[PDB]
Design a protein around this ligand. Structure first.
Ligand code: A1B02
Ligand code: ZN
Length: 140
């Protein structure tokens, strides 16, 4: 589990969104595994605006933050889980790292701020849904 809290937005994995998220919806995209809902309180996270390929992510199944090298956001075939049919997921970055399901939501960050959130992985893979192209998260 986990979310990004930027401005009056809450960014979560679409597959983990609550009824309150869907009732206060700003934007969602199944192909990216992302959903954004509105918040009453202002958040403290800042979004990175860059092309970094190194950063650190939080792994809840280890209680640890790990430094990683990750690929640029791409269209990747991901295997069937309980949440999606084997399909192509867009705007996804991969790194080598310990992952399990309930880790989705952990933040990946670089020197500029939050890069994305955990979404896919297994066999020492961890896939992050990028948010750096969502420039509108910084306004309104
Ligand atoms: C971090 N992590 C490890 C996983 C192992 C297996 C499945 C994962 N992801 C999901 O269930 C969510 C999903 C995205 O696209 C399709 N399904 C994993 N995430
Ligand atoms: Zn960066």
């Amino acid at each position: 589990s986990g979310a990004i809290y930027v401005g009056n937005y809450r960014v979560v994995n679409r597959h983990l969104a609550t009824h309150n998220d869907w009732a206060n919806l700003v934007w969602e995209d199944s192909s990216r595994d992302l959903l954004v809902s509105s918040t009453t309180a202002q958040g403290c996270d800042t979004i990175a605006r860059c092309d970094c390929q190194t950063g650190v992510y939080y792994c809840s199944s280890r209680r640890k933050h790990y430094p990683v090298s990750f690929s640029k956001p791409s269209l990747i075939f991901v295997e069937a889980s309980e949440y999606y049919p084997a399909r192509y997921q867009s705007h996804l970055m991969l790194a080598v790292g310990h992952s399990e399901p309930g880790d989705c939501g952990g933040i990946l960050r670089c020197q500029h701020g939050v890069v994305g959130i955990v979404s896919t992985g297994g066999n020492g893979l961890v896939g992050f849904a990028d948010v750096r192209d969502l420039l509108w998260l910084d306004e309104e």
